[PDB]
Amino acid sequence: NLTAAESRIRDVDMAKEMSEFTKNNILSQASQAMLAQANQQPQNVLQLLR
Amino acid sequence: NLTAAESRIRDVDMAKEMSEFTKNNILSQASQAMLAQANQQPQNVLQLLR
Amino acid sequence: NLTAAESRIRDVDMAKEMSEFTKNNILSQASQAMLAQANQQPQNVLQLLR
Amino acid sequence: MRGQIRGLEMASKNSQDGISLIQTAEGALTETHAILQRVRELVVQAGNTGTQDKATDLQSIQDEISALTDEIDGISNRTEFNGKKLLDGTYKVDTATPANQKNLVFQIGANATQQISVNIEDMGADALGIKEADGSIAALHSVNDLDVTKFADNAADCADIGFDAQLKVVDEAIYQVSSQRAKLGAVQNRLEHTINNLSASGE
Amino acid sequence: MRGQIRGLEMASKNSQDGISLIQTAEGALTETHAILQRVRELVVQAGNTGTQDKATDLQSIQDEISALTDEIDGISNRTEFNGKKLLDGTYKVDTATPANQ
Amino acid sequence: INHNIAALNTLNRLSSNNSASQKNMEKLSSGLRINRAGDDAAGLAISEK
Amino acid sequence: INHNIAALNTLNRLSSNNSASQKNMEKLSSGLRINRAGDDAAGLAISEK
Amino acid sequence: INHNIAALNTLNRLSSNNSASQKNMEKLSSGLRINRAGDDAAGLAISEK
């Protein structure tokens, strides 16, 4: 029972962690994506410039 | 952890650098552009000349 | 034990090597990429030229 | 404004290197824990007198434990981040002379007094303590670790050779290396929340 | 008219810097929240007596919480927009002396 | 507006979500939530004992 | 960030868990916990006698 | 006014912004901010050790 509670503290429910990992990785790829949109804003500033 | 801090010093966050690169490149093309406007000022000086 | 230390010397931890390979390959593709940006600098020099 | 922006990014990097250093120190404290667990186990069985005797078959255990305490001395000495020893008494919390604390002032902000003070100590003598460890007890319960012959003498009622006191002081050592290691995790939380402040305010 | 035009643009920029300052303050309050959540959690389990005892295994939790409160003091002190402390009692709502708001 | 793009927040959400996928990397690849002491000091202080 | 990936921890958890499956390989394939003296010196010192 | 056009500044902003895109070229194509020692000597002096 000590091992049980000790595991409830430290040892992870790796399913939940994996869902958290896939989730956060999507947030990451979404963010890099929004750089791929964000940097594209001043080139249109160059477009009215020319 | 040494590798980590060492990377925080030298190794670049290439996203930020890329945004910096696109940015500065636009400043460059804007500047060449403003040559394309700037040199066009004395030809109108030739226009009142003729 | 001799085989063990001998392997620690010569034989590679292929996981670390693979991460090194993917890494360096990205540095390569990034560099070819920055040729695809770098050579594009004087054509704008031709643009203010015309 | 530029001054505070750039200095605020660099303040972030400062905090981040601080995280790194702390992670190193704490790792040394991890292996410290594992060793002290081994020690505690060796003490429990070595306190299993009646069967664990010959007394030199405690000498052997003693030798092992003494090697482990030598390893605690090792870790406390050789732990270095960029060459800088941490765990040793350089960074005591508070002596009777507070003019010799020598805190771990980290720079955390782009302005004055936006800093964090951190302290750390442990070595072979990291057992129980009041201002110093103690004499016959409370450090050599992490340096000498009795059971050389010195349990077959008496069992529980001597306060310097009894199992209850000895093991209790091992539990103190675990408790306060655990405490020191528990401060610095919270320090890492401080620095993460900080860096979030630094990225926001920076932006 | 020019006076009000230019001063009205500059009034816009004034409001915009005001937005920025507020965003900084509020971010400090974000990390304040996260910390207070941690605190609340530590209190719930620390209120799980019967199993969370030894009482020094609450001392440890106490130490952690005290570190977090020190961080609230930190954030309240070090939060600065262009060097100006905000969260601290400089900007109290209304004292018994409204001459010191 | 050009010399400082306003998607600097994007760098912070990238450097936080990227910073969090990796906390899940260390946390998963050992099975332990208290792999690193900077997740919960209380659980360490108890679990050690 | 690119020239040094932060999943170096992953190499250490691989080189520890991999290093531990094999301690179970030697320890199982002989039946002995003190197959190698570097598991518990005390149990050796007693068990020899 | 004709024999010296006043957009010589334009040549300097071109020869600085052009000069900076290329600092990002060297700095990106190796991943290193201290690719060239003339970015921060301190980070070199520390990072070497």
Numbering used by the authors:
A (entry chain A), B (entry chain L), C (entry chain B): 255 to 304
D (entry chain V): 52 to 254
E (entry chain f): 52 to 152
F (entry chain A), G (entry chain K), H (entry chain L): 3 to 51
Text of the article:
While the three L-type mutants (E115G, S285P, and S17P) have a left-handed 11-start helix, the four R-type mutants (N226Y, A233V, H84R and A39VN133H) have a right-handed 11-start helix, and the designations L and R correspond to the hand of these 11-start helices. The L-type 11-start helices are tilted left by ~ 1.7° and the R-type 11-start helices are tilted right by ~ 3.9°. The residue N226 in B. subtilis is not a conserved site and does not form any conserved interactions with other subunits. In the R-type N226Y mutant, the side chain of Y226 in subunit S+5 forms new hydrogen bonds with the side chain of Q110 and the main chain of T107 in subunit S0. But in the L-type subunits, Y226 likely causes major steric clashes. Therefore, N226Y filaments adopt a right-handed form.
There are three parts to the flagellar structure: the trans-membrane basal body that functions as the motor, the connecting rod and hook, and the flagellar filament that acts like a helical propeller. Our current understanding of supercoiling in bacterial flagellar filaments, referred to as polymorphic switching, is based upon the notion that protofilaments within the flagellar filament can exist in two discrete states, that differ slightly in length. The “short” state results from a protofilament having a right-handed inclination (the R-state), while the “long” state results from a protofilament having a left-handed inclination (the L-state). To reconstruct filaments at high resolution, all protofilaments must be “locked” into the same state, either L- or R-type, producing straightened filaments that lead to non-motile bacteria.
